[PDB]
Structures are given as C-alpha cells and as structure tokens.
Design a protein around this ligand. Structure first.
Ligand SMILES: CC(C)C[C@H](NC(=O)CNC(=O)c1cc(Cl)ccc1Cl)B(O)O
Ligand SMILES: CC(C)C[C@H](NC(=O)CNC(=O)c1cc(Cl)ccc1Cl)B(O)O
Ligand SMILES: CC(C)C[C@H](NC(=O)CNC(=O)c1cc(Cl)ccc1Cl)B(O)O
Ligand SMILES: CC(C)C[C@H](NC(=O)CNC(=O)c1cc(Cl)ccc1Cl)B(O)O
Ligand SMILES: CC(C)C[C@H](NC(=O)CNC(=O)c1cc(Cl)ccc1Cl)B(O)O
Ligand SMILES: CC(C)C[C@H](NC(=O)CNC(=O)c1cc(Cl)ccc1Cl)B(O)O
Ligand SMILES: CC(C)C[C@H](NC(=O)CNC(=O)c1cc(Cl)ccc1Cl)B(O)O
Ligand SMILES: CC(C)C[C@H](NC(=O)CNC(=O)c1cc(Cl)ccc1Cl)B(O)O
Lengths: 222, 222, 222, 222, 222, 222, 222, 222
C-alpha cells in the first residue's frame, strides 16, 4: 500500500494504488483507497482495510453532522484536531494488530493568497500531526521509495498535469521496489486512482488520463 | 518461488522463475533456480538461497566423485538415496530457519521402454521421497496454483513443445496468484528458465522460445 | 467445508457440501450449510457449526424484524452493513476457537439493468467486506482448489444450467483435493445442496438434477 | 492409515490401505505400506513415512546379513527381539514427532502342528511386544473400527478366501469411519494391498481378486 | 459411562449402565443415569455426576414451569432449543473440569405418520445439536464400541423387544472394551436401566426382562 | 496390577493377575506377571510391561552367569543386593515415566530350621529393600485392599492349600476394589497365575486348582 | 554507515563515510571503512567495528598466504568462495549482536573484454552471495536512500569522474536521510574516502578531488 | 532534543532546537519546541511530540480559564503546582513509552527587586519540581553537554545579547556531541528558536539575530 500527495501552484493532488494482500497471497485487485471527505478535503488511510473504511465513513459523518448542526463548516485546524482525536482513540487497538494511518490533503479558502492554499497533513500512531512544508508526502509500506523518487522529480512540477505525472511516476517506482504495492495492469486494465483539489473543489481524475500517463511512463522506461 | 516439472512422451521438462525476495522487499530479479546435475538429471531447490546453492554444488561434486572413483555412473535409486540422505541431514538446520526442499527430474537409460523413461521425484522435510505417477509436480510457495492449473492443462501435452507451453502457463498462473513468484518482465526482458531432458541428454532451452511462448500466452489472456 | 457462489446472466447460484468432521473423525454426513435468508438473498457460513446456525437464525430474525417494523425491506447496502456488524462483534470469540466466516449472494431489484443484478459479497475475520467483480467466489478450507477450478471453467457459463454444472464440478474438485470436504455418495445417495436466485426469487434446487449432474461428471472423469 | 492382520487355518493374511495425508490435505494416493521381509514374515508400519521405510529396509538387511553370516536363519523369537530392539532405540525420536509403530505376521516352520503355525505380533511405543491369541489385530489411526468389525465378522473365516474377504471388509469399515484412511477408488482403480503367508511362503495377492471382492462388498452395502 | 438410544417402528428405547468411578477406583455400583423428563421425552447425561443431576432437575423444572404457565406443552424444537441453551451456558465450566454431555430421545405426537415419530438428538460441548437419521446413537467414553456394535446389529431390530436386546448387547460390548463402563453383575444382581417411549408415553423397563436378556447374551457368548 | 506373596509352614506362595490396560482401555487379557528366576526364587514386577520383562530376563541371565562362572550359586543376600542394584540403576528412567517395582519370594536352603526358610523381600523406587516379618506382602495399584484382606484372612493359613486359597481371595478383593486389576473370567476361562516354592523347589500351580478355588469363592460370595 | 560501489566503462569505484556512533552518541569522526585487499580487489564491511577490522585483516592475510604458497593468485570465484565461507562461519556470532556485512568490488584480468571487467558482489547474513548486473550497489543502514538516488543518477556516468561524482552525491543523500551516516564536515575538513580500480590496479583517491566535488554539490543544493 | 534556559540581569532567555527523529531516521526539520504560555511565562517540553503539544495547549487553556474566572492571574507558586500536578498525572503513561518532561522560565512581577525576578523551574518524572539557583538549566537527551558548556561560558553573561550568544553556543555544543539534536542548517536556512522574557513581557527573538550569532560562532570554531 502506498498513497502519495503533493502540491502544485493552484492546489493539491493525491494518488493511490489498488492492491490488497493477505500475507504473500493476493486478495484484491481493484481496491479504492482514496476518499473525498467534503468539498475541499481528501483523506487516504493505510493499514487494516476494515478500520480504514470505518474511519473514513465516521470522519465524513462527523464533518457533515457539524456542518448541519452549526450552519457553518469547520476550519482546517478543527478538522485536523478531530482527525487527531480519532487516531489517538485507536492506540489500544493499534497495538495487537488493528492499525490505521491517515494522510490528509486540503485547500484552504480562508487563506489570503490563493496560490499558497494547498495543505498536506501527516499523522503518527500516537495521534501527533505534522503540516508538511516541502511540498510532498507519502504513506504506506512503500513510502520511502516514493519519497526518494519525488525528491528528485519535484523540480518538474509546474501545474496539475505535471504533478499528476510525477505522482504516477512515484507510484510506479514504489510498486517497482515493493511487492505489496500494485503496479499498472495492462492485461486487465486497472490503474491507480487520483483526486485533484483546487479553488473549484475536489474532483476525481478520469481513468483515461491516468492510463495515458502510465503508458507513456512504461514506454519511457522500456 | 515455484518450480514445475512434467513428463511428455520422450522425456521430461523442468521450469522455474527468477524472483528473490526478503520479506516484502524485492531483492533479486534474475536468479537461476534450475541446475543440470549430470547428463541425464536436473534438480530444483526451493527455500533459503545459500542452502540451495550449497546443496546443488555438493550433490554435483558427489555424483562426479563416485563416477570417477568407480568408473561407472550410479543408478537412479542410488542418486535418490544420496539426495534423501543429504536432505535428512539438514533436519536440525531445517528447523529454526534454514530450509531447502528439492525436486528431481531424470531420464532412465536402463529402462526397457524408451518412451516411459522419464522420472520425477519429490521430497519432504524429513527426508522421505516419492516417485510421481500422475505426470507432473510442483514445489515452492505457489505450487498449489501451478498444480491446479496443470490438472486442467495436462490433456494437451503431446510432445516437448506442448509440455513447455503448459509449464510456462502454469508458472504464469502461479505468479498471478502468488506475490512471491516473479512473472514475465517485458520492460526488462527477463523470462523463466527451462531444461529439457530426453534420450540425447539434458539441454537448456534458449530464451527466445520462452519469450515467444510468454508473449503468446499474454496475448491470449488479454 | 467448501461453499461456492457464482453469477450467470439472470442471477446467481450458490452450492455447498454436506460433511462435518471432528478432527480426523467423520461426525456428520448430511449437514445443510446453505440458507435462504429472504426472498432474494442467500447466505453460507463456514467454521464452527453452532456459531453458524446461531448467526443464520439471528440474521434472518433481524431482517424480518426490520421489514415488519418499517413496512419496507432493507436495501442491499444495509444488509451488508448488518452482516458486517454481526461478524465484527464476534472477533473476541473468533479468537480462542469460535470462528464463523460468511458468504452472501443476492439479487438487486433496484438495479437499472436486470441482467447485471446478481451480487456476491465476501467477508473477513475482522468484519471487512468486499463485493466481487470477477463472477465467482469460494469460502472454506477447500476454497483455493475450487477457485482455481472455476478460473478455468468459467468460460462455459451461459445460463443457470451451465453455472450449476460448473459449481458441482468445482465442489467435486475441492472434495478431490481436500479430505475435510465431502464428495458425492452413491452408496447412500447424498449430494451437495444448491440455491438459485433470479428475478422471481430464491429457489432450492431439487436433488434429482444435482444427482444427474454428479453422475455425468463422474462418468466423464472415469 | 490402517493395517490389519488375521489368522486362518493354514496361515496368515495381512492387508493395508494406500492413502497418505499431510494434515487435512491429501498427498499420496497409491502408497504401499506392506512389505515382505523374508520367505515367511511380513511387516506393516504406521506413522511417519520416512521412518517406516527406513525401519523396513534396515530390518530386511539385518535379517539377510545374519542369514548369510551364520548359514542358518533366525528363529521367530530372535526376529521379535531384533524388531523390539529397533523400536526401543527410536523412543527419543518417537517423542517430538518421529513415530513408527510396526505389526508383524509370520509362519513358524518349526511348530509341531502345521495348522497352528501362524503368528501375529504387536508392539508398543516403548518397545514392548505381545503375541496375539484371539486371531486378529489392527494398527493405525482407524484400528478401533477395524477391530470392532473383525470382532463380529471373525466367525465366517474358514480358509484364505474368507479371511481375505473379512480383511477387505474391515478396511472398508475403517475407511468409512476414518477420514485419514483411503477407501476403494473406482474412478482411478486403486485398491488395498494384501499378502498371504502359508506353508509355501509369502505371496502378494493379485489386484484382480481384491477388486472383485471390493466390488462385491460395495454392491452388498448399496 | 455409556448411554445408548435407538429407534424401532413405534417408538424409541434408551439404555444406560450403572458404574461410577473416581480415577481408577470404583466409587459407585448402582448409579442411575437415565431420567424421564416428561410424558414423551427422556434424557441421558454423561460426565460429572453433580452437573448431570443439576442439569436434569433444572430441565424438568423448566419444562413443567412452562407447561403450567402457558397451559400447553412446548413443541420438540422448543425443548431442543432450551436444552441447547442450557448446554451452551456451561461452556466456561465445561472447560477446567466440569463437563456434561446430554442425549435426548422423544416421541412426537404432532407428526403426521405415527410410525416415524421417534426422534434422537445429540449435542456437543459448544451447544450445537444434531438430529439423528441413521436410527441409533451413543454417548460416553465407550460410545465408539457401542456404535460399532449397533452398526452390525441394527438389521435385526423389528419391534421393542428386538431393540431392547440390541441395546443390551451394545452395552455389553462397550463394557467389554472399556474399563470405565460397568457390565452385568451376577454376584450382586445389578443390571443396566432402560426406558421405552411409544405412543402411550414413556415407561421404565422392569429389571426381570433385562436380567433375562443379559443372561441369554452371556450364555450365547460363552 | 496386583501381585501377592505369603508364607506358610514349609514354604511360600506367590500369585498375580492377568489384566493389562492403557489408560482406561483394556489392552491385554492373559498377561503373565510371575516368573521363576531359579530353582528356589520367584519374582513379580509391576509397572511398565517392557521394563518388567527386560528386568526379569536380565536378572535370570545374571544369576545363571554367576552360577556357571563360579560353580556355586549365590546366597540370598547376594541376590537381594543384585536386585537392589538393578532397581537403583533405573531411578532416572523411573522418573519421567518408566517405572518398575519388584517383589521377591524365596526358600533358603542354608537355614538351620527348614520350617522357617521362606523369605519375602520388598523394594522401593530408590533401591531400598526390606525383609518382611509379618508373613505377607502385596505390590501394585491394588496392594492396599489385598493387604487389608490378608490382615483378616491370615489366621486360617495352615498349609499350602490354605495359603493358595487366601491368596486367591485377596486377589479377588483387590479386583473388586480396583478397576485396573483383572478378576476371574468365566466366559473366557482365564484365572490368576500362582507359583509355590518349598524344599523341593519352585513349581507352577495348574490352572484347574485355581479355577476350582475361584468358583468356590464366587459361590460363597453369592 | 553507508558504503556504495558502482561500475563505469573501464573499472569500478567504491566510496564510504567516516561516522562511528554508539547508540545516539557520536564516538568517531574519521573512521576509515574501505580497504584495499590486493592489487585488483577492494572490500567494505558494515556493522560492528572490531569484527569488520578482524575480517579485513584475516581476508588479506589469507589471500597473501595462498598467493605465496601456490605462486599464482586466486581467481575471482575462489575469492568469492573464501569470503562467503568467512561470512558463513560468523552466523552464531552474527546472532546475539556481533554482525558484519561485506561488499566486494574488483577487476577481472582474465575477462575477454577489458571494458566489461568490473565486478560487484554483495553478501547476506547466512553466507549467500550475489553478483550485481545493474551497475551499482550499497550496503549499510542508509543503503536504501543511496540506491534510490543512484537509480536516478546512473544515466550520467560516462567515465571515472562521473562515477565518483555520482557516488559522492549518493553518500550525501544517504547522510541527509540517515542520522547514523556522517556528512561532509567543512568546519573540520573531513570527507568520505574512495578507491578506484581499473586495468592498472586499485588506487586511493586524493582528498582534494573529493573536497572539490563535495563543495560543488553543496553549492548546487544551496 | 535539547532545550536550554538561563538568567541575565533583567530577565530570562530560553532556546531550543528543531530536529525530530524516529529512531535513527530523521522525520522533522523545523519543529518548534518552545511556547509562550502567558505574558510572563515560557515552557519547553521534551519527549513524545503529541504528549508535549497536548500538555502545552492544556496548560495554556487552564491558565487562561483561571484568569478569566477569578479576574486575577495566578501567582508563580500556583502555576508551578498546576504544572507539577499535570506532570504527576501522566506517571502511568510515562511508563510504557509516553513520557514528557517540561522546563519552565518566568518573570515574577511581585518581587521586591526587579533585577532578581527571573525564575527557572525543572521537573522530574514523578512530579517533583526544583527552583534553580545557579543561573542555567538544560533538558533533553543532550542536556549534559549543554550544561557542561554553560558551566564554563556563564562568566561572560552581562545582558540579553550575551545570554543569547551563550545559549546558542550551548545548543551548538549539544548538537556537536549528540546525534538526536539538530544543528544549524546553512543549506536550508533553519536555526534554533529563542524567547526572551523581561519586565515588558515575553517576546520571540527574530531569526536574523540568531542566524548572525550562529554564523559568527561557526566562523570562530573554523
Ligand atoms: C486499504 C488496505 C487494502 C490497505 C492495505 N492493507 C491490506 O491489504 C491488509 N490486508 C487486510 O487487511 C486483509 C484483507 C483481506 Cl481481503 C483479508 C485479510 C486481511 Cl488481514 B495496504 O497494503 O497497507
Ligand atoms: C532460490 C531462492 C531465491 C528461493 C526463494 N527464496 C528466497 O528468495 C528467500 N530469500 C532469501 O533467502 C534471502 C535473499 C536475500 Cl538477497 C537476502 C536475504 C534473504 Cl533471507 B523462494 O521464493 O522460495
Ligand atoms: C457447518 C459446519 C459443519 C462447517 C464445517 N465445520 C465443522 O465440521 C467443524 N466441526 C464442529 O464444529 C464439530 C462438530 C461436531 Cl458434530 C462435534 C464437534 C465439533 Cl468441534 B467445515 O468443514 O468448515
Ligand atoms: C506409511 C505412511 C503413509 C503412514 C501414514 N502417515 C502419513 O501419511 C503421515 N504423513 C507424512 O509422514 C507426510 C507425508 C508427506 Cl507426502 C508429506 C509430509 C508428511 Cl509429514 B498413516 O496414515 O499413518
Ligand atoms: C453419571 C456419572 C456417574 C457419569 C460417569 N462419571 C463419573 O463417574 C465421574 N466421576 C465423578 O464425577 C466422581 C464421583 C465420585 Cl463418587 C467422586 C468423585 C468424582 Cl470426580 B461416567 O463414566 O461418564
Ligand atoms: C506387567 C504389566 C502389565 C503391569 C501393569 N501395567 C500396565 O498394564 C501398564 N501398561 C503398559 O505399560 C502399556 C501396555 C500396552 Cl499393551 C500399551 C501401552 C502401555 Cl503404556 B499393571 O497394572 O501395573
Ligand atoms: C566500521 C563501523 C564504524 C561501522 C558502523 N558501526 C558502528 O559505528 C557501530 N559501533 C560500534 O561498534 C561501537 C563503536 C564504539 Cl567507538 C564503541 C562502541 C561500539 Cl558498540 B556503521 O554505522 O554501521
Ligand atoms: C518535541 C519533540 C520533537 C521532542 C523530540 N522527540 C522526538 O522526536 C520523538 N519522536 C516522536 O515522538 C515521533 C515523531 C514522529 Cl514524526 C514519528 C514517530 C515518533 Cl515516535 B526530542 O528529541 O526529545
């Protein structure tokens, strides 16, 4: 499992793979690991699948409940605090074998400068959170390879297309180096999933663009 | 790791993959797991790499030493006994984490009927050996999937080409179902390795034929 | 124990065996492992017998109770959520030796296209659920052999008869490869049990058809 | 695994099944578990396969070595003592998971009365031996069912044919009650193996007679 | 301890022995292990004596309480459910050394066909219940020998006398093979206890008939 | 297991039962537990069967070897010392589950008074020996009941017949109170075994006398 | 600790850092971790310092001893075998906390093509060795970051200068990502150490070139 | 992690580093570890990050809550007591791996002499607090080196500038001796953070002054 997120001038882009394994046996081929929490926020959780889906559905319900009750949406710090509390509450279950690690991406509409409005937040198993300032982050078992690839490929990002290409390349490198991460499937036609957040909101990326980018990358590497 | 062996009218064919892993991290991409022990015998070992290479080199040296000392090669039962003794001697090291499991294929020149001269022998961790009579066998972590594929694909085998195609298809299915088994690599150009034993001896299969068969299988599955 | 389920154009078919064992001793010969929960849903549970019957009776009562209380039946997602909650609640008892794993098959009447209305859902020990998209699934100790047989026999399915024949063949292969699965009994006259769900509801398959199919398969293999 | 032995006026008959299992997985279908040690003695060992074959080959070599050295064969008590010593020496390996339990059948040529010359000897894990006086014995995991069947079917034995039929029926009952024992296979054509010892020596029973007896028993039970 | 139950055309018959032991020391010689719960149901419990008597007295009180409260007796399925709940509630005490295993026999007055109205129900340590369809069942430490004897002696049962004789013979065989089961005592005059249930209700069998049957069986075996 | 020995004016008498058990399962019905070591000494061993037979055969061989080497038999104290050394050497194997406890009876030919020449010696698990002076001793799991019966029945002993009757009665009481001790079998015709040692040597008692005594005792108790 | 090795047309280059730590405390600032074993071979060991120096001095002495004894140097395979034996012999000490992992670089003078004569060999804790075919390798705790940097920077290598620059950059990245690896020190003037092997032999790189390259890299990153 | 605090005539100065590590891997480069609790008090916590932020936010909220409720701020002893209670309450979580150790600096406005109004308070894991009287204190894993540096550099402190320079030098020495402490970064431009408290309140130090001081110190050491 590997989920990447990065910033471009105008917003953020988040991408994730589709492989689910049970030890060394492949169990799932088209799992979706990226969710749209609200109009300007996306979350990606790694670890036990059931805990991840439960956390995602609970977080979405809590945000919607607050928005309906108070008539106004929460600020970014409030959402970070709620997610940190949810993560901290699972420490006892995080031990003994039910662990979930989230990653958050968002667009701040209250920021003075619209260009620097994209935010990426990472979390730890004890509930501590950190706001990234380097422009990219990765979570999962193949996060080190993806981070090392982005460290070299980040100079090419100029807009959304460049960032999406860099994210796909990082996922490809992570799948190349890790056996628990699923690479592109050309026999079946399964590709990673991406979400792009900008001033107009959060939109899912169509699969044709990702397929074209993956084919171009595969041709380049060959 | 998955090594398959099967019989065709005239001889035997053995095939193996090339992936080496350390947990969930990929460590080796072009490992060779099939050896030619002598003019009419091939061996394939699964498990710890160092133990496998040590076992193979030791077995070859022992066979050559006996042949040079006595002026006549050993019979098939003698080779089986020597391999079983070698396996039985590693029981203590097989426990605690140094395990090697071999599979043997051969052609008997003393058999009355040259058609039914191919032999396949399997071994267990305690040193017990079994001579196969169904026509195929597989060893490794993905052996169950390969065996289940051969159970359905064995009716098509008529000669060496048919058997080689069936072996490649079984390896492909094993790699599809298991993450510790390496599939064909078209970006890099790495394919499984095969050895064919018949009345003229044991010969390594050139990589072009295996590449053609793998491409045909991939096109068929797509 | 092995329970299989598969999709055909028009609906779904689920099949199960009849053997119950206590270690290596045979305890039961005509156990029924497939239940009709409601007019359009079937469930099959593997594991401890008492837990399975308790889970089945409880699930049926809960569905009927909701239908009577609200005057309208639940949707498919609601039933999946209820089953997942029931499975998740038994985690503590799943450890230490009281484990039950269910498999769900159903027909969605709210789907726009009646042809693609059959659904198959699998579950894990932690309460996570997955909706199948390949067309078949198996649960139990012999599920791997049945899945590997269906992977090769799925191209022949065209209607209900073809699917039933494929399911019986998969159960036969699972019983051939596993000793904890009961095969057809011709001395006594005991055969697996099947349920077919289509637009008209869920119907139990009469035993004469299954006996004829099993006899044909046995004759073919001989 | 189940091996039976019984006495008839004129000699002894020993029979055994052909199933080999690894837990709940079937590993072997045509294993031979009955050996002819010398001209008037047969042995059947249950437990770990490798230990059983090693014990059998060692016992045969020791008997032949003594016969060649001294120019005269050993008496029955000497053979019993040698087998008991061999069993007693494996106590340490019998613990921790390498256990072999033998059963011996023989014809005494030094007995005054040729009619009462058949002997059956059983052994325990500590090396103690017992000479049977009831006329039948069984070893293995399904020995209780076979013994209970012979207790009722022993009144019909008059000659070799009657004893062979009773032995086949006892093996059939043991396979009916135990899942680790292999029953007759009519799809493949595999049947238990039998050895008959009389004043002329020890002879293997041809498979046609056993197939006919098994078919008759199956027809009777149906 | 061994309790047997079997079906004959017209009803059911249940029988039990009288030995109570504390390790290898004999503690009781005339213990009664079969109870008449109501007008058409009998129960026999094996295991710890105190738990068995407590379970029996509690079950009888519960059935009588329901009958008095509702003015109508429970159906057979309700009684089975109550007994299963009672057994399931003792799982924690079943572990660590307070185990009780029941067996139930009854006559259904609501059945359409009076001939096939006898029912035999067995239970497991986790609370799972099974309805027998072969015609006989045994519980206790000597149940295997009794079952194997009934498997051969069931063809002679035609009416109540035949069934009672078969039950006494099965108990005799169980006592012959097991040392924890008490056989007939001719020095003291103590014999097993039996209960016969038919359309007129459940009646205890007088001891003279059982003594005559036991004497006849002993004479036959001598 | 219970072995009794007692003194009468003129010599000694030793008796033993014939039951062999494996837990609560009966394994042997006609085991012989009393041996004649030499012309004036008898030994009876209780515990593990194999250890007992090994000890007996070894003791006999050692006594014969000394007699042949030195040309003169050992004295009684020397035999006691040899037996005590043999018992002491098995202490390590006596722990962990291989225990053998002997009892010795003999006639001293060097005693001044021929009337008081019978000797009974008992041993403990550490190798300590004691010479009895009360006139009787018992070994085994039912030794307490036999000793308590002899304490009351010893006043009737006058000669060999009286002592034999008392020994049979003590064995009968031990079998009555203990389930691991075999009583007289009238269906099969198996009775305890006795040895009588006097000035003329040690003689085995014929079975007819023991059968008559057992029948008389059974009639008296009835 | 991080040691890198890579191939360029004409030979090989190996580089290593200088930090030694004891937990989180810095103990050494100018440790040398790269040795020249002979005229055409270099070795770099990571792990416990004392074991590394002992292994290096022993390997050099063994190679020199063989060269002096036989009058001819060993071949490359012989050196690999000797190093593998030395590593395998320390398995017991490798456990419990004395671990040393080597990496070997060399130039083969017996190769037909002088361009492709550079060899890089890696080893595992059990004694297994692998010959690299991708052109670079890294060992130590920061090996993953260095490998990921070389995977992107390898396309620039054309000659010795390019390879040395790439090696220094990889070491810089490893020190950036790992706290147990020492980076360039400009206050003190301490830089990594490098060895270059080509057709003329193995030569140590002067520190001025490495200082210039490190200053250029630092200026580029700033 | 290292946080230093010291006194100068007129007030106090507190400084801290910016490195966050996870074992031997660097995780954070610009972490802020010094907080302004109120107008005259600063706190610095070392240990687990999440616990530190939670403690800081809770302490600030508690102080503000008391000030708003009572209309008057707490005295210094009251704040010390509240912090000690908060530390004491985490003892159970301090064990097993969630430890936080604070350090407090403040200016007392109720002191008679404004010159000697700066206070430094240290705490232990059990909740005990100590008021420093030597003029400086350090907390963290590199506190010993910083304390030993201040012991020699304290004679130069005359005003705020001297104290700030001494604090930066102590942090530099701690980073030199400890690998878990971050030193000045000139490639990226990250420097430690400082807070100065005097009669006018608590003010954050601008980064330009700290950068100038760090550059001067680095030039001096070179
Ligand atoms: C979203 C999620 C797929 C993340 C990934 N985790 C897993 O796949 C872990 N796997 C299971 O939880 C699991 C899945 C099934 Cl089907 C059965 C049993 C188990 Cl144990 B990842 O690589 O980190
Ligand atoms: C021939 C052999 C490759 C067989 C296969 N086994 C392994 O790959 C096991 N792996 C290692 O031994 C190993 C390899 C390295 Cl590079 C480092 C550490 C370890 Cl621990 B297989 O899949 O069964
Ligand atoms: C529906 C159910 C039969 C499923 C199957 N499970 C079992 O048979 C497990 N067996 C028992 O639970 C059990 C049965 C009895 Cl009669 C007594 C004791 C025990 Cl322990 B399967 O193969 O997975
Ligand atoms: C002669 C012998 C077949 C007797 C029987 N024992 C076994 O089958 C036990 N099985 C193995 O030893 C064994 C066989 C293989 Cl192929 C692989 C691993 C193992 Cl662990 B029996 O039922 O008692
Ligand atoms: C109805 C009952 C007699 C059943 C049987 N169980 C027992 O006899 C077990 N025995 C005791 O519980 C017991 C009896 C006494 Cl007197 C003292 C101590 C103990 Cl521990 B059976 O064979 O299964
Ligand atoms: C002479 C001897 C029969 C004495 C008696 N001991 C035993 O019977 C103990 N039993 C066995 O040793 C034994 C017998 C067999 Cl057939 C199989 C396994 C075992 Cl474990 B006694 O009651 O003290
Ligand atoms: C060549 C060698 C420096 C390699 C490196 N290993 C170490 O530094 C380990 N450290 C010690 O062994 C050690 C050093 C001292 Cl001064 C005192 C105690 C210890 Cl325990 B590396 O990073 O892998
Ligand atoms: C304020 C705080 C940074 C103090 C320092 N502590 C730590 O850095 C400890 N580290 C973590 O807690 C931690 C950080 C992350 Cl990103 C992930 C996992 C863990 Cl486990 B120090 O050196 O004492």
């Amino acid at each position: 499992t590997t989920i990447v997120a990065l910033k471009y001038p105008g917003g953020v882009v988040m991408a994730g793979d589709r492989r689910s394994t049970q030890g060394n046996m492949i169990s799932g081929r088209d799992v979706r690991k990226v969710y749209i929490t609200d109009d300007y926020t996306a979350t990606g959780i790694a670890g036990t699948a059931a805990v991840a889906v439960e956390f995602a559905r609970l977080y979405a319900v809590e945000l919607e409940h607050y928005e309906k009750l108070e008539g106004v949406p929460l600020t970014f710090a409030g959402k970070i605090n709620r997610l940190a509390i949810m993560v901290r509450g699972n420490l006892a279950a995080a031990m003994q074998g039910l662990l979930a690690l989230p990653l958050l991406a968002g667009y701040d509409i209250h920021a003075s400068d619209p260009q620097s409005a994209g935010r990426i937040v990472s979390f730890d198993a004890a509930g501590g959170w950190n706001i990234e300032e380097e422009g990219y982050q990765a979570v999962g078992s193949g996060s080190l390879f993806a981070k090392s690839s982005m460290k070299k490929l980040y100079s090419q990002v100029t807009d959304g297309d460049s960032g999406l290409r860099v994210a796909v390349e990082a996922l490809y490198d992570a799948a190349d180096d890790d056996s628990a991460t699923g690479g592109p499937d050309l026999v079946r036609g399964i590709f990673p999933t991406a979400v792009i957040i900008d001033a107009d909101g959060a939109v899912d990326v169509p699969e044709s663009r990702i397929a074209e980018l993956a084919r171009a990358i595969i041709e380049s590497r060959s």
